[PDB]
Write a structure and sequence with these properties.
It is classed as cell cycle. The structure is cut from a larger assembly and holds 2 copies of chain A and 2 copies of chain B. By secondary structure, chain A is mainly alpha-helical. Chain A contains 1 helix and no strands. Chain A is rod-shaped and about 70 Å long. The chains are: A mainly alpha (about 50), B mainly alpha (about 50).
Chain lengths: ~50, ~50, ~50, ~45
């Protein structure tokens, strides 16, 4: 019973954790991409000049 | 001047070599950060 | 597992130190190449003269 | 000079994303262990 109870709780927590992680990852990725793009553009311009 | 142009080409190749070295260093730093996070998690689990 | 992870972390730190040394050597080579390019510009000015 | 700062920020973001991916892999391993423990707990309940 105790184990089951713990398991149940753990299960819920696990799910939540996963979701959170995913969200964070997504956000980070997006940000990174944007930054990279901007940088590239700037560099290109400079080079051209 | 032709020899200087050859040296400039060698310098341009060394620039790409340095860029590859910097990329490898960044990858190694990311791997070290991931390993440190995993080691902190394992240390917390071992303490518990 | 923690001893294995500590050995892996020590190996990764040694690899990072080797990569930093290689980056410093590449920076020294780039400085030598900049000096060679300055000498090449001086030689080109001498050739124009 | 802003290009170097942007590259450093992108590298820091990539390192944070790698740390988050390692944390997510650890969470997935923990979820698999929890599913195995739930199967074992169902067997123990029977």
């Amino acid at each position: 019973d105790s184990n089951k109870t713990l398991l149940h709780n753990h299960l819920k927590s696990i799910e939540s954790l996963k979701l959170e992680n995913s969200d964070l990852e997504g956000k980070i990725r997006g940000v990174e991409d944007d930054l990279v793009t901007v940088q590239t553009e700037l560099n290109e311009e400079k080079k051209r000049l | 001047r032709k020899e200087i142009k050859d040296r400039i080409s060698s310098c341009s190749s060394k620039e790409k070599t340095l860029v590859l070295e910097r990329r490898e260093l960044e990858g190694t730093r990311v791997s070290l950060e991931e390993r440190t996070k995993n080691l902190v998690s394992k240390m917390e689990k071992a303490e518990k | 597992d923690e001893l294995k992870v500590i050995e892996e972390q020590l190996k990764h730190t040694k690899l990072a130190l080797a990569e930093n040394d290689t980056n410093m050597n590449e920076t020294l080579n780039l400085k030598v190449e900049l000096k060679e390019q300055s000498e090449q510009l001086k030689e080109q000015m001498e050739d124009m003269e | 000079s802003k290009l170097e700062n942007k590259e450093n920020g992108l590298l820091n973001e990539i390192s944070r994303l790698k740390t988050s991916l390692s944390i997510k892999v650890e969470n997935l391993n923990d979820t698999t262990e929890k599913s195995k423990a739930l199967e074992s707990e169902i067997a123990s309940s029977s």
